[PDB]
A = this chain, B = another copy of it.
């Protein structure tokens, strides 16, 4: 009875703070820190908050195959901020692309838009 967000983030300090705000807002959260660990949790998520710069590669390269598993909204959240990065991320299947540093208020609003 809560919408489940999958957060894929290897910056521990950021995820720590973000997960508290998301949980306080009433979301159920799953936290993964590597590309190798995304698939087992993918089907449980109602929306994926996905960083690109992960310890085992670039998640945008794996996003099309994840989309084949389940078509959930995906918001890329990364410090790869150029227009070329954004075009690459969105054309690989992402529904939105929020740059780091970001405002939690914007991330919350973009989550709502994807789940309405």
Contact A110 B83 (CB under 8 A): no
Contacts A112-B90, A113-B90 given: A83-B106 contact, CB under 8 Å? yes
Contact A87 B106 (CB under 8 A): yes
- Indicate whether A44 reaches chain B with its CB closer than 8 angstroms: no
Residues on B with C-beta less than 8 A from A37 are none
A94 to B106, CA, bound (A): 13
Q: For the complex, count residues of A whose C-beta is within 8 A of B.
A: 17
Residues on B with C-beta less than 8 A from A94 are 113
A86 to B99, CA, bound (A): 14
Task: Determine which of B86, B103, B105, B109 lies in contact with A106 in the assembled complex, contact meaning CB atoms within 8 Å.
Answer: B86
- Indicate whether A10 reaches chain B with its CB closer than 8 angstroms: no
- Indicate whether A23 reaches chain B with its CB closer than 8 angstroms: no
Which 4 A-B residue pairings sit nearest by Cβ, starting from the closest?
A90-B109, A87-B109, A83-B103, A90-B113
21 contacts between A and B (CB under 8 A): A83-B103, A83-B105, A83-B106, A84-B105, A86-B106, A86-B109, A87-B105, A87-B106, A87-B108, A87-B109, A90-B109, A90-B110, A90-B112, A90-B113, A91-B109, A91-B112, A91-B113, A94-B113, A95-B113, A96-B96, A96-B113
